[PDB]
Amino acid sequence: SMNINDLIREIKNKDYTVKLSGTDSNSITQLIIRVNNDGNEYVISESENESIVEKFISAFKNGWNQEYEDEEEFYNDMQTITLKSE
Amino acid sequence: SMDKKYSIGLAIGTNSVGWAVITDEYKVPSKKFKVLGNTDRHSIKKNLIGALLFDSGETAEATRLKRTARRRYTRRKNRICYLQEIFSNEMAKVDDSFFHRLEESFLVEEDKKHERHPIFGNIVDEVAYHEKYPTIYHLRKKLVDSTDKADLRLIYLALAHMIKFRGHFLIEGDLNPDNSDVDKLFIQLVQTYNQLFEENPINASGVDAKAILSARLSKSRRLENLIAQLPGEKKNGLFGNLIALSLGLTPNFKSNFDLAEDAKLQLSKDTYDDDLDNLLAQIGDQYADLFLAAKNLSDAILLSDILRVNTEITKAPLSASMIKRYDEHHQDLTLLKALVRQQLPEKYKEIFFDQSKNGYAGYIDGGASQEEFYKFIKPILEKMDGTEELLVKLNREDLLRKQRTFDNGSIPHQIHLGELHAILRRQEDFYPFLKDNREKIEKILTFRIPYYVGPLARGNSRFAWMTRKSEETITPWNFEEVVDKGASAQSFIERMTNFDKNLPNEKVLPKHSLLYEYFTVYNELTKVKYVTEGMRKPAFLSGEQKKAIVDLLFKTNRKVTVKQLKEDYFKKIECFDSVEISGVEDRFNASLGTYHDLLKIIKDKDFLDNEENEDILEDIVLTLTLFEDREMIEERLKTYAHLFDDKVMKQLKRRRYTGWGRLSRKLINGIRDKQSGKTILDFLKSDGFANRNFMQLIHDDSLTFKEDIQKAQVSDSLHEHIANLAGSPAIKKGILQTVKVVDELVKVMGRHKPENIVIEMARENQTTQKQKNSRERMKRIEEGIKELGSQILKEHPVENTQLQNEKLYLYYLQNGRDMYVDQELDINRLSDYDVDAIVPQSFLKDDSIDNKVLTRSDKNRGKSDNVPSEEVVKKMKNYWRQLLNAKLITQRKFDNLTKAERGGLSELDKAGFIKRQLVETRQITKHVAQILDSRMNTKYDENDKLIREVKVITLKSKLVSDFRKDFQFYKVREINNYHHAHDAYLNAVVGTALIKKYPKLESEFVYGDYKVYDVRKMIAKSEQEITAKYFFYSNIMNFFKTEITLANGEIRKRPLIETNGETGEIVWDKGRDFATVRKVLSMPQVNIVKKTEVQTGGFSKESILPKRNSDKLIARKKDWDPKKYGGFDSPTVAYSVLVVAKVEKGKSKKLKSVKELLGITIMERSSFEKNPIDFLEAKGYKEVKKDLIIKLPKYSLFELENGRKRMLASAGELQKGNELALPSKYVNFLYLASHYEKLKGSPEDNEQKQLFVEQHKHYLDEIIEQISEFSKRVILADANLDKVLSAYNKHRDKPIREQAENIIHLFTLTNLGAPAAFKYFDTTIDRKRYTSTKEVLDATLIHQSITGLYETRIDLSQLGGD
RNA sequence: UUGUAAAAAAGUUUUAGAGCUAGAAAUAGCAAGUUAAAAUAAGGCUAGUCCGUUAUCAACUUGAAAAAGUGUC
Ligand SMILES: [Mg+2]
């Protein structure tokens, strides 16, 4: 597939500031993507059953979801990332 | 009450700090707190429990790489300026606006102050120049080879191109076969390989590697052709994969090194350098030279392929080769068009015009990479006839290449210097100033600031240390006579030394220190045992034997193996026949590598063994670690010119070393044991019966080492102490917040200090979660089952994902047999069988596989309360041995199984379990404890002994995690953030209860110097002995339980009220005190605070975007209108600012009043902070009310109607501000229901738990009503809640476990923070964003202190008026 | 286990590499492409071949800044 550090690398290559947070044993780990640098932030947190990379792919494989116009580009960029992992 | 004594609990993490105050009865107090501000609220009662949340602290690395990129651009820029300085006066006589035209070449024609054609100034000469010189390499070859006088502008352009793009500095001196040729670099690779595998060398005698590796075949073909010449070597062996790495392929080194997870490597990947670091982490730093030598050869092959070298000799081989590539590109392009035009003419448009496709137009004009272009045309070539040649070129990666391209980093600067120098010699007679500056101009290209000099500062750089010996501008030409090289290097060494943790004020040694490496061999050598014919027990190595081994094996070879040990030494020096070795596996990991490097170079075995010269050699290694500047190495070795020949002197400098170790020379061979006068290394050599290593010798409290280490660690300010920690920058941030919480809580509690501070610290870097360990599980079985010669994996297929079932793992680990009876288990009936603890729960809570076995019935262990019976041990020992030799059980697990042979569990065993339970092994937690302790305990008594008013206590998280599962105080992190606070409370409970029951155990878990009690003396010899002897059943958390069940089903009852017998104090009332704990965990008012911060870092997204007439783009320079030039998008808001002012609403210029929220970008910040009203006035606003300008950083908190809260993510987006306090009863239901299967416990209650979830299926509907009433009130995502409410209906009849698992997903609708997508079964809920901040401007802004106990509430609706 | 020094190759952006034939245009047909300059955080004053993305930050009082205070018998 691809792992969490691959995914972070790919998102950064699309010119998005992205942070992995919560990597304590105490906190739930969360991928946070700064979509626009103005408060829009796309958060994928890890579940016990399903992982961040799994959630990312199932969320962005079919491209944009038409919800917010200021995110159409962001969904296209994330979709191309899904294709990469084959 | 009246009691004022209290204790503090803490849960330090990298994104959170939980804290709690407790009283002697484990209650959390409640106090009224003054509420400041302008509202009607003047006080609230708050519970003293909560948690601070914060963004991760970040490393200085990203900042550093951006800093070094800037210095590189600045200095490249300056090389060009130096050249132009040299050219200016003569260029002026030739073309007086030429340098002007290049300076302004970027401007649109409207803005150019000169004529738009840079080189010549008119269209005719420019068009002709380009036809004559289609690439800069045609100009370079012509200028290198011709003897004509040339135009001074063309001479400039060729020099500038070599000086601006001057190539690499990886090779020192002139190029020659040994630093540049494929054959020589190949030899070095096999020499390096044969150095690490003496037993199985590569013999490459006839092997023409230059021809095989430099040929014009694909990469995989050259790998085959090379390996075909090495009988014994598979293509994917270690050497083959090294050659594959050298050729640009991506070998997988996993199977080479018998790793669990694969280790793919590719030298060109941006990730390569730490992909290699992660490989070397596993296999050993010893292999670093191997991958380095593979890397050097890689460069020599790439450069070989770039220089199509031949005997049409030029002085311009590189330009010549690029011209050839230009022409070949042209021919193949012409043919490609023809073949397409003939066979696929409908694809012509796409391939050559459509630059959004990855064909030729995308390749030249549309950003497509070479790799992408090849992937696009290859199917098309394969469709056409006459494409065989082109496809060969493609699969060789040599089709239609450009000249500026990714290979070029393997071009040494010495090549550009070659052409640069030739050109000057051609023209220096037609232009005397070129002759007079020839060496000045070549210096510009070759000079390089040495590492050890650093930035050439003059007072105003925090990174600089360089030292002048003349106050004048340093240039490439005056450097050696202006820079004080000696003093700068001295300062370099000081700054670059790390000090010994164990004993500060002592520098650490190089990682390749001969002492470090002697130390490391003797520390491995001291745990090695043996047996031979006629011996009672497995004996240790006599120091006289260790000394003889290091002299005949380690000082003669690089790797010593159990074979040459058992054969070359035992059976050839000690007259043995067959010696069992039992401390060392295949070979020795440590080595005297440096000894052999110096033996090979210096060729003087006596010199090296004379432990009189050991300072000379260590200083040599020291110099080759600190330095790479051969000129500075020459100066620092000048003293030993008498000692060594110019042949070995030369070879020394060319040998490099990198790396530091952890220890100082004084630690290893400095401090001496008082009574013995033995240094540490002195002990590793001789020690008699007991053969201790290093970690023992430090830990050993019977010697003087541990005491002096402590006496050593002695350390001013607070941020000093925190910078000085071995820790990630995230944890240091969390530590500093933790200190601030403790201070604030002290204030809250009347400035009275606590009785105890209990600390627990999270483990970092638990990133991967779930798969990594499950391949290890498969790795262990495959090696072990094979080691047994078992047919169990053919009879029963292998799949590493059901290896996470612990019963199935143990089944395979035990070769499919009962661990307690010589019988077989049924793999299909594992549900009938019991997992059993070797050491029972009553002595220790060890639930790892190390302590578990699978038996058809746990009654097969025997009838003891102990380890399994003597009978089992006599019957099964020989089967356990096989499992041990095959690594299917650890040694430790073998000793526990067989313990009944040695009497069972001794007091010594129990004393160790007790240490294992209390003692926190991590160094970082000890330094946190020392900071807190140094802060709280400041006073000294009448005898100058520190008065420890506050006891700071460190708990292993396992104690509280086990407490939670034992007494069903379950935690579900997804519900809300309370669990951080609850953890701190629970630490306070357990730590303070522990310190009451077990005062004599203080030294094990309270910071400071206490009486150290022989714990053995506290252990009762029998249960009847129960007097002042604490433990029979070694599990220290037993006093919380009311009954404990022993390993034979017997039940031991304890009193309801537990007391310390020695001191009379009550420590736990099982009625009262559990209810206290439950009552605390169910309190809905917990102070959860998210720390507010200004945003720092980059101004914006980094893409340099094409021009738009969108005014949203940010210009890259002051006068570059992005409507003409492009620029940047999406700036970053440092903070938002509340602005009340007037604006104009029309042509009348009449003033409407406004109250707005303005984001200040990081870029705008200084401007705004210098003249805020001038800044605001220039943005529109007038009549600004300066006294109401409120800085609103990220996460600023607001409260609206009905306790609904929002946090500020920026000036134009909000985050959720509320926490959903689900009642404690629903929490444990969710945990039990969603773990209904994976339950872990006694069937007697694991069945009782399952009936609890069955009889509370109605909690499902109650929890949903909780979610729904919270959401209608504060989430305000109506459509979303309608969707989840129906989705809960569509599945009301799915199993309880399944509905509970999905109800947990539902809490991301309600979580604090940014709204996030989630699922409920198949239904997907899209996040409802809060894209309007308007409502916040009439709400209550809540300033919070770090605990949230102290607040100022500002009602913003009172602003906007007078 | 942090922190730091030296260098290189790409990439991007704007400009320069006179596009041609036919046509009243719209447009169609073709030719062509591989290179270069310059910027690469806006910039700053201390003007260095220096510095500019880490750390640090509730509110309020006092300080230049470490830091010290304010809510509590
Ligand atoms: Mg600059």
Side-chain angles (χ1 to χ4, degrees), chain B residues 708-710 712-719 721-769 773-932:
Chain B
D708 298 329
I709 291 197
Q710 271 275 327
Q713 326 210 53
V714 151
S715 151
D716 29 2
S717 63
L718 173 61
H719 293 48
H721 300 175
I722 304 213
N724 297 7
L725 295 193
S728 92
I731 206 53
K732 296 176 162 131
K733 178 181 197 172
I735 296 178
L736 169 67
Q737 308 306 315
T738 293
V739 172
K740 291 200 296 169
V741 164
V742 174
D743 293 330
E744 183 152 286
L745 289 176
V746 166
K747 232 192 91 175
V748 165
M749 309 294 305
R751 322 194 199 262
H752 296 160
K753 291 156 186 305
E755 297 302 300
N756 314 284
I757 311 177
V758 184
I759 299 171
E760 88 100 61
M761 290 203 42
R763 289 207 179 252
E764 289 198 63
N765 301 327
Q766 304 309 312
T767 276
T768 10
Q769 257 85 66
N773 79 291
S774 176
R775 266 167 281 251
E776 293 281 4
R777 280 191 183 188
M778 186 94 97
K779 186 189 142 202
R780 183 171 251 101
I781 285 173
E782 255 143 14
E783 274 159 65
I785 292 304
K786 284 163 210 184
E787 221 298 319
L788 290 181
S790 177
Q791 301 302 314
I792 226 278
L793 282 175
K794 294 163 176 312
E795 299 161 16
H796 291 307
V798 354
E799 96 272 358
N800 75 118
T801 29
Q802 198 145 298
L803 244 48
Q804 267 302 298
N805 178 309
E806 113 180 315
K807 276 202 186 56
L808 197 272
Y809 185 36
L810 295 165
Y811 165 95
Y812 280 105
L813 285 163
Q814 296 165 202
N815 204 22
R817 327 209 87 237
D818 205 302
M819 195 62 148
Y820 289 155
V821 207
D822 188 21
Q823 286 162 349
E824 66 156 16
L825 303 174
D826 194 330
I827 192 174
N828 290 314
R829 327 203 70 145
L830 295 207
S831 216
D832 293 318
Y833 306 151
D834 302 354
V835 178
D836 187 75
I838 308 166
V839 182
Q841 219 199 149
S842 11
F843 306 86
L844 191 79
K845 178 81 162 131
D846 177 357
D847 256 325
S848 76
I849 292 290
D850 225 78
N851 195 45
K852 279 172 169 155
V853 311
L854 182 61
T855 173
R856 182 182 307 279
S857 173
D858 67 342
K859 277 154 200 57
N860 291 333
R861 75 195 306 292
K863 278 152 47 187
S864 74
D865 72 7
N866 221 260
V867 280
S869 66
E870 222 173 54
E871 169 216 325
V872 172
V873 172
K874 64 179 173 101
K875 294 188 187 165
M876 308 303 304
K877 197 185 167 318
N878 281 336
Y879 163 68
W880 293 332
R881 178 75 63 189
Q882 304 179 354
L883 291 180
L884 176 53
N885 300 330
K887 304 204 163 185
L888 296 159
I889 52 158
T890 174
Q891 168 71 239
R892 162 162 192 263
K893 182 170 175 172
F894 177 79
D895 294 326
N896 284 335
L897 291 169
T898 48
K899 214 147 206 55
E901 251 183 1
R902 291 159 267 146
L905 288 188
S906 52
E907 308 159 341
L908 209 273
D909 297 327
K910 292 172 173 173
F913 301 155
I914 290 159
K915 259 209 208 59
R916 187 147 147 172
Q917 295 164 80
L918 293 164
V919 172
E920 171 58 61
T921 78
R922 276 186 293 170
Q923 262 294 107
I924 190 52
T925 73
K926 171 156 179 303
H927 283 261
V928 180
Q930 173 270 305
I931 288 179
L932 293 186

Side-chain angles (χ1 to χ4, degrees), chain B residues 291-311 313-530 532 534-535 538-546 548-553:
Chain B
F291 293 90
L292 175 57
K295 163 63 183 168
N296 297 335
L297 177 71
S298 169
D299 283 329
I301 290 159
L302 288 160
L303 169 68
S304 160
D305 289 332
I306 284 168
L307 311 177
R308 286 320 204 205
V309 258
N310 65 70
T311 322
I313 254 314
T314 339
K315 307 307 285 189
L318 167 76
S319 301
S321 221
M322 293 292 93
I323 300 168
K324 174 160 296 104
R325 184 188 286 181
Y326 177 80
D327 285 335
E328 295 192 18
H329 186 145
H330 170 59
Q331 296 149 30
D332 300 334
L333 177 55
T334 302
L335 174 62
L336 177 62
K337 293 174 169 170
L339 291 172
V340 173
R341 218 109 217 193
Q342 163 215 20
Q343 309 184 39
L344 312 179
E346 331 88 285
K347 299 189 158 168
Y348 197 101
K349 209 177 188 192
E350 171 153 284
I351 301 172
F352 303 102
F353 286 84
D354 188 342
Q355 63 178 259
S356 71
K357 270 48 184 165
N358 287 345
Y360 190 68
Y363 175 55
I364 295 297
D365 286 321
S369 69
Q370 175 182 299
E371 180 179 289
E372 294 179 300
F373 168 58
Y374 288 172
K375 180 171 166 277
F376 175 95
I377 30 136
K378 187 164 158 169
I380 294 171
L381 297 178
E382 294 173 353
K383 286 176 189 116
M384 298 183 286
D385 303 310
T387 51
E388 296 73 20
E389 260 276 20
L390 297 172
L391 275 168
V392 165
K393 277 151 165 288
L394 186 157
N395 291 292
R396 204 204 299 144
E397 286 92 67
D398 205 21
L399 178 63
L400 303 176
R401 290 206 78 203
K402 314 179 170 182
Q403 294 77 33
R404 301 304 294 284
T405 186
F406 51 87
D407 297 338
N408 286 359
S410 55
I411 295 171
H413 76 270
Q414 294 95 334
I415 285 203
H416 297 300
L417 183 61
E419 291 183 6
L420 182 299
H421 170 76
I423 284 173
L424 291 169
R425 303 231 76 248
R426 296 321 207 177
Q427 309 299 304
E428 65 175 23
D429 291 308
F430 308 119
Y431 296 98
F433 85 99
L434 297 182
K435 179 198 263 294
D436 289 2
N437 298 258
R438 182 200 51 258
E439 322 215 325
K440 230 213 226 169
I441 293 160
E442 311 174 3
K443 195 63 166 181
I444 290 163
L445 179 138
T446 63
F447 174 74
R448 176 188 180 205
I449 297 185
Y451 271 107
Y452 76 84
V453 174
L456 307 181
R458 214 177 62 179
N460 297 295
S461 168
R462 51 178 263 241
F463 313 94
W465 63 85
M466 175 260 160
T467 299
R468 286 151 196 282
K469 69 194 176 197
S470 158
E471 299 297 333
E472 65 186 355
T473 283
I474 301 168
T475 58
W477 328 289
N478 71 18
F479 187 98
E480 75 182 25
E481 279 288 58
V482 163
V483 182
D484 185 339
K485 275 136 61 187
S488 314
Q490 191 44 61
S491 318
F492 175 71
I493 299 173
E494 303 160 351
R495 289 166 145 261
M496 296 293 154
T497 255
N498 286 9
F499 298 106
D500 194 348
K501 288 184 208 162
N502 292 347
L503 154 62
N505 300 27
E506 299 294 318
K507 311 157 181 130
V508 289
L509 288 158
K511 206 188 52 195
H512 297 238
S513 171
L514 292 92
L515 201 73
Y516 199 86
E517 282 186 7
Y518 279 122
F519 157 86
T520 224
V521 177
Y522 275 117
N523 186 96
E524 197 178 317
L525 244 190
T526 199
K527 295 327 213 69
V528 68
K529 276 173 173 151
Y530 65 128
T532 180
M535 288 195 89
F540 270 126
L541 263 195
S542 156
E544 328 181 24
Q545 292 182 313
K546 294 162 188 197
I549 286 169
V550 311
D551 276 324
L552 298 131
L553 301 184

Side-chain angles (χ1 to χ4, degrees), chain B residues 486-530 532 534-535 538-546 548-558 560-562 564-565 568-570 573-576 578-584 588-602 604-611 613-645 648-649 651-663:
Chain B
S488 314
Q490 191 44 61
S491 318
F492 175 71
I493 299 173
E494 303 160 351
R495 289 166 145 261
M496 296 293 154
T497 255
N498 286 9
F499 298 106
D500 194 348
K501 288 184 208 162
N502 292 347
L503 154 62
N505 300 27
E506 299 294 318
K507 311 157 181 130
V508 289
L509 288 158
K511 206 188 52 195
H512 297 238
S513 171
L514 292 92
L515 201 73
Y516 199 86
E517 282 186 7
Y518 279 122
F519 157 86
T520 224
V521 177
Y522 275 117
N523 186 96
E524 197 178 317
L525 244 190
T526 199
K527 295 327 213 69
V528 68
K529 276 173 173 151
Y530 65 128
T532 180
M535 288 195 89
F540 270 126
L541 263 195
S542 156
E544 328 181 24
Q545 292 182 313
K546 294 162 188 197
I549 286 169
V550 311
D551 276 324
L552 298 131
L553 301 184
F554 286 90
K555 275 185 179 207
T556 304
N557 317 120
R558 279 195 143 80
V560 184
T561 190
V562 183
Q564 52 208 85
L565 187 73
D568 268 315
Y569 174 75
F570 279 115
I573 283 154
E574 311 256 285
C575 91
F576 291 119
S578 74
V579 196
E580 154 202 331
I581 315 294
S582 171
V584 103
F588 296 93
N589 320 316
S591 174
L592 305 186
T594 308
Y595 185 80
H596 296 293
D597 293 325
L598 300 180
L599 191 35
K600 194 138 243 181
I601 298 195
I602 224 181
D604 197 327
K605 182 95 152 47
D606 303 335
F607 185 79
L608 284 164
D609 276 307
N610 181 8
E611 280 157 53
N613 292 336
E614 109 123 15
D615 283 2
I616 292 175
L617 309 169
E618 289 268 0
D619 168 59
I620 291 163
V621 163
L622 183 55
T623 264
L624 300 189
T625 295
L626 290 169
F627 292 101
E628 303 185 355
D629 195 77
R630 97 158 265 172
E631 218 215 50
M632 194 67 214
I633 298 190
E634 216 132 322
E635 189 65 7
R636 288 182 65 91
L637 299 199
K638 236 63 180 176
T639 38
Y640 317 130
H642 65 281
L643 285 168
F644 310 125
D645 218 327
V648 50
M649 205 63 186
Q651 212 178 341
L652 268 193
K653 293 147 184 162
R654 306 180 163 69
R655 139 61 58 192
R656 203 129 72 211
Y657 284 123
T658 71
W660 306 90
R662 261 285 172 274
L663 317 162

